[PDB]
Each structure stands twice: as structure tokens, then as C-alpha cells.
Ligand binder design. Structure first.
Ligand SMILES: [Mg+2]
Ligand SMILES: [Mg+2]
Ligand SMILES: [Mg+2]
Lengths: 277, 282
């Protein structure tokens, strides 16, 4: 059973969420199996950012057991800005554990190296998720984002508990039941860092969302990129912390070393409300 | 100075917010002056609903001193649903005090009676407002919504403290600094009750946002309807509570109605049913 352990107040530098299996911290990167049901391609998704929020929370590569923390740039907490007509993130946002966009090789589909992170997942169901949630999802398709010039696939997925899950099996069903969401998704990932002073991003395949079979192939490829990583068979592991507790860099002590749970959400600066056009 | 007095937890049937002056309740409908600065057309806006929220909090006409209370439909808390690509309300939303969309006459611009409420205001500035806030706004323009067949004008306004306020003087400026916003606003008010099983709403003038001059004329009309209402001279005041604490020449003036209000009993926001998360694709 997966739960969460929160250290600190949300929206501060001290905030961390560890995932616990039966009350014991595990690595959110390496210790949650990618497959909840391999035979039926049901994946475990680690939720980082709930729909309609701004705080850029993420599994951190360089801390032990890879807790979810807030991204920073040069000491300042990162909040993704509101880009009209969108409010924060327009998906439940996260990653599949046990995957890696390998930064050391060029991906033939996009002519770019990977962004060094677990492959990202856009979960499109009704219910807003919580940071640190491990949910079970089916993959519907995939989009090829070049994120400041690096391969940054976005899997389009739905919670198997969603009322619509039985009617959603491939990328075409997203167009049926969520008309406009794929367009909005294309726009969002293109422009979301312009308010930060970064360039517009671009997608390979003219922004096309590839179907489920294509997505399963890419996911399995990043999962293999991950098996080379965790084996220490890396030409360059890029400072990632490879410690784990359910599985070399294995270290069963790591789970007891995590501090105990703690605070109410801290205030967010009013500037984060602003809608950019 | 204006403050709030909250009774109960937000997102419950018991929740109420009264607006206070000098720490004592006044009527949110009747006692807050329409104009903060008459000579410069600066209005007091009563905020009901913050941008990007759902709970349909509104001034309560039929309750003494007209506190803001969550609307209900057949007794259940009313939450406006999320209609893609929007999240809840896309403006800080509320009303001008001392106005009324007269329900007893057909309004010439729309050929329909009024929706029996204070004129509504969409405040477009960057900072998210709070329920019971009295802010000072400039009017920029106005749209003629027919909300379930009733005249329901929406003033386009901006907080005078917004960084952009000095650059926003008329309706054309909204399109310049907020491109797509007026178009989205037209869509929002057409579709927002479709998830409630209501028909699509309609606008007069094919949704055109009329300019500031036009807006000021309609705001005056609604202020005049209210002057008649509060004096006890409406042909049918619809059971509205006209009790006030600042208008001595009215039959329903009573400074002591303020003393009768219970003290604040502010509790933490109650949970909202997860169904309200849902994004509706219309
Ligand atoms: Mg990043
Ligand atoms: Mg990424
Ligand atoms: Mg109205």
C-alpha cells in the first residue's frame, strides 16, 4: 500500500514528499514498479503536480530516495505561470517510475538527446490528483516534445478508476471525449516557459499525438534506458542518486534514515495569480 | 474601512459572509456606496466569487443585511462546473451595490425583464480577489447577457490598483492587453450552465462588448431602479430585505440591525466533493 510522507510546508524550500510502501520510504524513481499489471499494460504513475496548480513539484534526481520537492532556479522556488486561457498545469502531471530519457544518446524520432528525467505522463481524468500519489493508468498515446531542444516525450494516460476509462483505449478516443484537449496540450507545452523568458518549445511530427502501440514502444525503450542506468552501465549517469530499498547502489538502510513526517501550505506570492497573454 | 465577518466553514450550508464597516455589519446590497469617487466614475465592487473557483457564493437579497451565502439548487450547494478550456469563473466576479436589474419592466436593449439582482461585474485584473472584498474599479465596457431569458448585463471592470489600470480606459484597451479574454467571456456565459442541464444562454448585440460610455448609462439605469426599490416605491420588491444601516431617508433604515448579527465563527474551508473537479467538454 502506497502513502505519502510530507516534510515541511508546501511552497517552501524545505518541502519534500517521500512515497511510502507499507509505511516505509522507498525511492519514487527506482522502487515503484513501472507495471502494476504488465500483461494488460497498466502502469504505475507517480503524480508530481495536480491539475490547475503552479508549484513545479518533481521527483528529484540528486537526493536519496528521490523525494518530490519544488524545483528551484538559483535559489528561488519555481512556479509555472498562468498562460491564458490555461490555469497552471492542465493535466495531472507526473512520471512513470523506472524510466529515463537517456541524455547520452540521440533519439532517432526527434534528433535530440533525452532530458535526463523519468518519462513524463499527462493524466487526463476528471479527478484532481495529489502530489506523491501512485495511481494506475492506461496509456492512450504519446507526443514528442523538444523541451528547449531535448527529447521530452509526454505520454497521454487515464486513471483506470476514471468513469470514462472503459471507453478510452487509444488516442482517437481522446478526440471523442475530450475535444480540444490535445490542441490545448500542444499549445501549453509550446508556450508555458515564455513568461519565464525562455523560447517557445516545439514538437516533432507537427505536434501529432502518436497512438498507443507507439507509446508502449517508447515507454519500454525508456524503461530499458533505465535498466542500463540503474545497473551503473552508464557512459554518464549525470549525478542522479541511484539508491533503492526493495531491490549495487542498493541500500536497505536508506528507508530508516528518512526523517519523520511533518505543516500547512505556505502562502504563494500574489504574482503567481497573474494571467499572461 | 471594509472588512468581512465569516460565520461557519466555506463550502457548507451554514457559511455566511457579512461586509463590515468599523467592525460592524452593513448591508452588502444597500449600504456600500455605488461610487467610491463619483467625479471620476470609480465604483465600489462587492466581490462574490474569486477567479478560478466554483462555489457560487452570492449576496443574499432575502436575508437581513444581505450577507453572501452559497447559492443552492433544490437544497444542495451549488458549484459552477468547469467547462473546458475554463477553470471555474474566469474573472473575479460579483456586483455593484445599490443597483438592481428591475424584474418588473422589459428592458429596451434586450426586450426582457431583469434578473432581479444587482448588476454583475467581471473584474479582469491579475490578483485573485476574495469573497466579501470591496474593491475600487473603473468600468471599461459592458455585455448584454440574457441569462435564462433575463436581462443580466455584465460590466467589464478593473481594480484601480492593478499595474495596468492607467493603460485601461475603454473596451478596446481590454482587447489590446487581454487578447482573447472578451471572446472567452462571451463563451463562458453562454455555456456555464449546460452542465446543469440548462440551455445555452444568448447575448444581445451578437455578444458585442459596448464601450465605457454605454456601460455608465446602464449602470445609472440600474442605480435608479435601486433608488426606487430602497425608497419602498417598486411595484413589486420580490420579498427583498431592504433593511439598511446608512440610509436614514428610507422606510427600512435601522442602525441597530447591525447589533443583531452574530459574531464571526470562522472555521477552516470544508472539503468539496470530488465531482466538482470534473472538466466538462461541451
Ligand atoms: Mg525540469
Ligand atoms: Mg521531462
Ligand atoms: Mg445577474
Amino acid at each position: 500500500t502506497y502513502t505519502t510522507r510530507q516534510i515541511g510546508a508546501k511552497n517552501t524550500l524545505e518541502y519534500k514528499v517521500y512515497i511510502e510502501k507499507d509505511g516505509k520510504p522507498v525511492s519514487a524513481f527506482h522502487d515503484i514498479p513501472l507495471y502494476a499489471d504488465k500483461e494488460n499494460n497498466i502502469f504505475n504513475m507517480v503524480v508530481e503536480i495536480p491539475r490547475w496548480t503552479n508549484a513545479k513539484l518533481e521527483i528529484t534526481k540528486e537526493e536519496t530516495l528521490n523525494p518530490i520537492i519544488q524545483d528551484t532556479k538559483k535559489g528561488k522556488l519555481r512556479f509555472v505561470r498562468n498562460c491564458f486561457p490555461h490555469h497552471g498545469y492542465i493535466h495531472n502531471y507526473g512520471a512513470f517510475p523506472q524510466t529515463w530519457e537517456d541524455p547520452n544518446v540521440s533519439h532517432p524520432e526527434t534528433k535530440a538527446v533525452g532530458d535526463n528525467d523519468p518519462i513524463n505522463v499527462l493524466e487526463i481524468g476528471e479527478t484532481i490528483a495529489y502530489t506523491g500519489q501512485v495511481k494506475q493508468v492506461k496509456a492512450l498515446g504519446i507526443m514528442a516534445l523538444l523541451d528547449e531542444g531535448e527529447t521530452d516525450w509526454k505520454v497521454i494516460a487515464i486513471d483506470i478508476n476514471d468513469p470514462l476509462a472503459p471507453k478510452l483505449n487509444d488516442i482517437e478516443d481522446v478526440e471523442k471525449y475530450f475535444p480540444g484537449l490535445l490542441r490545448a496540450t500542444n499549445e501549453w507545452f509550446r508556450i508555458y516557459k515564455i513568461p519565464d523568458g525562455k523560447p517557445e518549445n516545439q514538437f516533432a511530427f507537427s505536434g501529432e499525438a502518436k497512438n498507443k502501440k507507439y507509446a508502449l514502444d517508447i515507454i519500454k525503450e525508456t524503461h530499458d534506458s533505465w535498466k542500463q542506468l540503474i545497473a551503473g552501465k552508464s557512459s554518464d549517469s549525470k549525478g542522479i542518486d541511484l539508491t533503492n530499498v526493495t531491490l549495487p547502489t542498493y541500500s536497505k538502510a536508506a528507508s530508516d534514515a528518512i526523517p519523520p513526517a511533518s505543516k500547512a501550505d505556505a502562502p504563494i506570492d500574489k504574482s503567481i495569480d497573474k494571467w499572461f497573454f
